[PDB]
Amino acid sequence: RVVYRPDINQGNYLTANDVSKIRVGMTQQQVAYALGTPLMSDPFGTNTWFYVFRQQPGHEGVTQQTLTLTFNSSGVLTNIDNKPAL
Amino acid sequence: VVKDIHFEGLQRVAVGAALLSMPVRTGDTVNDEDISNTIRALFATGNFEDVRVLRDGDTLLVQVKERPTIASITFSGNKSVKDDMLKQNLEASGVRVGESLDRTTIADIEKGLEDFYYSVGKYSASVKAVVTPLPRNRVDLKLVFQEGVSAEIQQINIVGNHAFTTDELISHFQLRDEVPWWNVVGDRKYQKQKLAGDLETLRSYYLDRGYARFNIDSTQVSLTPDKKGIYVTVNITEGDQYKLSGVEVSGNLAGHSAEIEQLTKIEPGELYNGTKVTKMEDDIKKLLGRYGYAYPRVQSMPEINDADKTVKLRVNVDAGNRFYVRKIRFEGNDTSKDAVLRREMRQMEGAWLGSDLVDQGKERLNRLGFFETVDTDTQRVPGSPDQVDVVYKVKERNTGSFNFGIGYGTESGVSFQAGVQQDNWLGTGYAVGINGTKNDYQTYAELSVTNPYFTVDGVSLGGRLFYNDFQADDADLSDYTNKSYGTDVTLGFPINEYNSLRAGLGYVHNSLSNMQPQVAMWRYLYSMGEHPSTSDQDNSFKTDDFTFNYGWTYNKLDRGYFPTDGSRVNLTGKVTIPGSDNEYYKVTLDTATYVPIDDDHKWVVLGRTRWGYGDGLGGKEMPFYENFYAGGSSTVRGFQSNTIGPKAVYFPHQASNYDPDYDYECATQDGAKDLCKSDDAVGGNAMAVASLEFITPTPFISDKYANSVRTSFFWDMGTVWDTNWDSSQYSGYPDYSDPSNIRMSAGIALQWMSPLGPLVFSYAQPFKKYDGDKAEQFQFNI
Amino acid sequence: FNSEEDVVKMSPLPTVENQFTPTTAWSTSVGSGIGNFYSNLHPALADNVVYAADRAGLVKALNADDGKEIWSVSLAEKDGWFSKEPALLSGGVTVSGGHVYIGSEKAQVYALNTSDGTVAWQTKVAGEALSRPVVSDGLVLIHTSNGQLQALNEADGAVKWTVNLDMPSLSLRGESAPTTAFGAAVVGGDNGRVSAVLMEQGQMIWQQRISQATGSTEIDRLSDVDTTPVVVNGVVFALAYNGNLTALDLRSGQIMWKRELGSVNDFIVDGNRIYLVDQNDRVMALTIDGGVTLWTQSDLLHRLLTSPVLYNGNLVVGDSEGYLHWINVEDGRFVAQQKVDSSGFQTEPVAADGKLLIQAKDGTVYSITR
Amino acid sequence: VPDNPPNEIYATAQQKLQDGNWRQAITQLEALDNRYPFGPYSQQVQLDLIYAYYKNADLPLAQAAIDRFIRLNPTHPNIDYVMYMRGLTNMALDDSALQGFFGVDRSDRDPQHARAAFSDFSKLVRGYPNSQYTTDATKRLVFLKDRLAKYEYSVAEYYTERGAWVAVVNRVEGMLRDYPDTQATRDALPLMENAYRQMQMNAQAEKVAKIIAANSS
Amino acid sequence: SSDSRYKRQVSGDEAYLEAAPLAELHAPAGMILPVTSGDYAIPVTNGSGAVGKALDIRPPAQPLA
């Protein structure tokens, strides 16, 4: 037990704008554009996409927004949800 | 028409390729114009021509004789340059060794080479090649060249300079007009590159004055044809001071203009200087590099207003990207765990871009030294607009610590004393220290081992040991019978990133028997309360000590073996716990630092001074083996081992558990039998050493390598004495109770670092003669 | 360290066999001190009246009488960006009476008129003042080694005729005196560019060049050559940077023809008699004949200074090591008799007022005659 | 370097080659070649001297000469031999050590030369599915792939050691499309579900638990 | 670099004839994934050559004049 730690963070750097903008059907072209390189989908299974962020400093708190996405085989923004801050 | 055609004297090309090379063949009416065609084709072969064409009847012989081959090497007259550089200036020039070498080529290449001499800015008068043909087809040339060397015959001239004195400006130059050499800090020589440099230098200077408009300037370098007229002038035309009044940005940015105005924080009525503005530019770029956008672009358009010298400022910035990092790849762990390599890291594969952070990890490495190469190659995946990927190629340097031991003695066994203190152990980072001495009277064990790594914190336990049987008896007794068993292990853990804190525990046994005639020993015995003898060499003692061992150290080390501008400190201390066989109070503190006066840092200066102080806790004193010793060492050279120090007198020792004959003089039976002043460097309970030198890789060493030969010229200072010292028993004897033991020594330190061991030649001329100076101006260490 | 160049040095002193023993020595010295610094400074004999100086902003009027001192003035200026602002003086020597004309490397020229006194009217010239100044027809003539060429007026200065020549990049050492004639002047260049302003606007009649010089097909490091041609009979002859004879016969205009010959130093003409030293430091003589020569020489190759003059039927050439070598009863007799100084010498020798005039590298003058 | 003609110098070359004075063998080799760099004997000595480099372990010279020839003669019968020896050189580069001589504590260094040997031998075996070396070079390649699987295994092991769950997962997917054949592959699979838990990657986790139960033996 | 060795065994151990072969892994019903991404391809038609260290590693010579 050390009293404190350096903070740790992970990908999917976004804004509340970055969620308020997009919506259903929006093509993966537009979405991967306006939201950036999507860094989380399944190598096997549906066109389901994920945006997750976390930050853990010095033994305190949790900042876990976990945005799940799907497209269809064609690619349609569809079946979307985030769970923010864990 | 011909029916047969035969060639010879080729040695290089088949008859088929040769016949298909020249235009004529068999099966066509060979007429005179075909003969001229052979003539002109041989001429036009370009690498070889010799037209000897005779068609008598129906037979055709086309004969081209070959100046090839040749193997000319004899680069003679190489007096300032290497012959291989000459070979380069052939091959890289296009005079490579594929050698046909028509006789014409001699003057052409000689003279293009002399051209290269001028390219140096230099000259060489004779350049001659001498045909030595080898009678297979080969030749060699005696390449004799006498030099016309011309490097610095400078002469400064400046025109248009009327807002300042030329010389104010000259000062900061690299290109200098042959000043007395003892002022040298850096370099002074000519080169067209030196030109371009100094040019830009003062350009920049003048414009960052606030002075704006000057840019017009042409080269005029007067050259008296002596190799020596180096007389150099350039036109200029001063521009306009402006006041910095007005700044504005064009933020094509994700939104940081708050932080921007925060940064481009400009006072009214300011005066312009390109310095601060270049700065602010850079500053903003850095503020954003952490933000991932590794690719902006700015044009700072200063609204130069005349009649007010207003440089209103307009800049314009474009955004970059957020997140790339996708691969963290290294080059060089040929026999190495890259585990530790990633241990020195803090940035993460898989986030957005603070380039600074990979930079931090790298420079952290480079602080660790042990390797010589920079590499941060950050490649972005073609086929994805993001996902740049940093690469790291560094060239390590080995460490092997070995010494060989055989002899040399007269009445004692062939010595096998071992120095092997190995480190960063090739497959790991782990380090071991073993100094095993087995010399015919002395079997002193030594262990000191440590893992750099136990945790993600990287903590380290120092497994360390010694076991010393130091007797060095005359026969078996009255000669300090001793055993000493000292055990200790230590951990250190900092979180200050530069300041280590050490705290460890140590045990030692120490055995005594057959005390000696040093009165201070008996005196310490009485300090403990132990009644020892005074004329008998019979006194014994054993101890088993429980002392705490705590340390600290500051660290900012620019390199490894040759760190620059070192800023690094050590704290060290020992204290005894309840339940031990010792009590004392001893402090010791050492310091070493650098300053490179060169900023190419070819010239650094050492700042090194150390401190050591010991006394006792309640009722007791600092034990004797814990005293500070010095002389003829790499803190003070010119003496013999630990020769500087106080000198202990002797009590009359005559009934001394066989006080020997012809042996142990200074108050023995055979010798004088009364009180005896003995000359014996005992070392004091307090020490502090200062030493100074200068880093200069001399031009007289072939500095074709800059990290294995080291060149020093040192001076030092010292005085060491007893603090718990009196004259009641040193009335007629010398007194050591203050800093009084001054010795001085100046000397050169001669070092070339070969991986296996250092050749430590050391002459120091010890000149501040304090009593007990037993000098040795040669200590050849390894 | 930098001297392991074991070159063939000065071809040794020849004999001093000379009926003509150096007889006079009227001494006088500025004590300075020119040293290694390179320019044309040279005694001015204005009606046997001399005016001496050195490279510090100095004056002293003398007299070809054994040289008594007058007008001893110092010109280095005390206020401004510095105290006395060291005057360093690379200018050729010319006057019009006491209207003494010269500028220095400082790109600033003083035409003091020590006939009406300290008439220290000045102009900070475009380009820099190095060559020997030439006054033609109420105008002053300018070869600033700047690629520029001006014209101004005497006792006043007035910038005009602003001519630009072109330069070789390596920044060679050719400074040049214009030889004025026919509303034109005959000056030299270093790119070999041969041009001749008929002084109309600054109007050359010219685009040709000497193709043989230094800078791209550079030549060796001793090709010192006088860059100042002279018209005779309308016929001008050229002294190219590299050893290259050329005769551009100016017939109120440009007529050109190169009778090329190597080894260029500096020249004199005697009707048809062309006397000259070859850049080997050897003296050839020639005629207007297409370049047919006479007068071999080798005894003084690489003898440092070879700076010529003639009077008394005596070919007299200045050298370093302060000697005198007397040609005379001309060829084949070339031999000397003198070693005058240790300072050596650098500049043109002046045989003026029938007399002999020269500065010493250190100190002014020790007037010696046959 | 005496001046024995290619005959004598070459014979003594064979003497010290089959003899095993590979250093002096190379001395006489270069004697002949620098004396006579022309001819089919010159090319034969080229091949036998790349052999002798590999014998004397002259890997800088070895790689130098072998690539000099590969660009030099890009058309040959022994191209199989050439790819063979060159991949072999990549190996020898990548695996020269003391603990490797002990055969212990290895496979955690720069596998770049392993990558080189792999590319080489693959080019060989598919450009030449038909050679004395084809089965052999195949054994090479499979060994190398397996070794790497292990190496990178250790690597991302270190990641998750430091906790680089993401970086781990990424290396996983990498080898997944690369070569999920070796033991290290299935071996690493559980660590995937570990990271899942670390990040609470639930559905993916139990899905891969199912699929590994199908794959795990 | 030989010590009466270095002809018919690799430097150190060889694991070729010691190689752990391919693991054809069984995916559940419909659980397939991209089989390959690169060089991962072998022409099985070959051999059996002088497999292991039983092959003339010396240069196969050629006739000379």
UniProtKB/Swiss-Prot annotation, chain B:
Residues on Periplasmic side: 1-400, 423-430, 452-459, 483-498, 554-566, 596-604, 695-708, 754
Localization terms from the record: Cell outer membrane
Result of knocking out the encoding gene: Deletion is lethal. Depletion results in the accumulation of incorrectly assembled outer membrane proteins, including TolC, OmpF, OmpC and OmpA. Decreased expression leads to decreased susceptibility to contact-dependent growth inhibition (CDI), and decreased expression of outer membrane proteins (including in this study LamB) as well as up-regulation of periplasmic protease DegP.
Effect of S641C: No effect. Lethal
Domain POTRA residue range list: 1-67, 68-148, 151-239, 242-320, 323-397
Effect of D476L: Very minor growth defect
Keywords: Cell adhesion, Cell outer membrane, Membrane, Repeat, Signal, Transmembrane, Transmembrane beta strand
Membrane-spanning intervals of the chain: 401-409, 412-422, 431-438, 442-451, 460-471, 481-482, 499-511, 540-553, 567-576, 585-595, 605-615, 685-694, 709-721, 744-753, 755-765, 780-782
One GO CC term, this protein: Bam protein complex
Function summary: Part of the outer membrane protein assembly complex (Bam), which is involved in assembly and insertion of beta-barrel proteins into the outer membrane. Constitutes, with BamD, the core component of the assembly machinery. Efficient substrate folding and insertion into the outer membrane requires all 5 subunits. A lateral gate may open between the first and last strands of the BamA beta-barrel that allows substrate to insert into the outer membrane; comparison of the structures of complete and nearly complete Bam complexes show there is considerable movement of all 5 proteins.
Matches recorded under HAMAP family: OM_assembly_BamA
Record-linked PANTHER family: OUTER MEMBRANE PROTEIN ASSEMBLY FACTOR BAMA, SORTING AND ASSEMBLY MACHINERY SAMM50 PROTEIN FAMILY MEMBER
Assembly with partners or alone: Part of the Bam complex, which is composed of the outer membrane protein BamA, and four lipoproteins BamB, BamC, BamD and BamE. BamA interacts directly with BamB and the BamCDE subcomplex. The Bam complex has the shape of a hat, with the BamA beta-barrel crown in the outer membrane and the periplasmic brim formed by the BamA POTRA domains and the 4 lipoproteins.
Entry domain remark: Contains 5 N-terminal periplasmic polypeptide transport-associated (POTRA) domains which interact with other subunits of the complex, may recruit substrates from the periplasm into the outer membrane and also act as a chaperone. The C-terminal region forms a discontinuous 16-stranded beta-barrel transmembrane region. The central pore is ellipsoid, and probably closed by extracellular loop 6, perhaps with the aid of other loops.
Protein name: Outer membrane protein assembly factor BamA
Species whose genome carries this gene: Escherichia coli (strain K12)
Lineage: Bacteria, Pseudomonadati, Pseudomonadota, Gammaproteobacteria, Enterobacterales
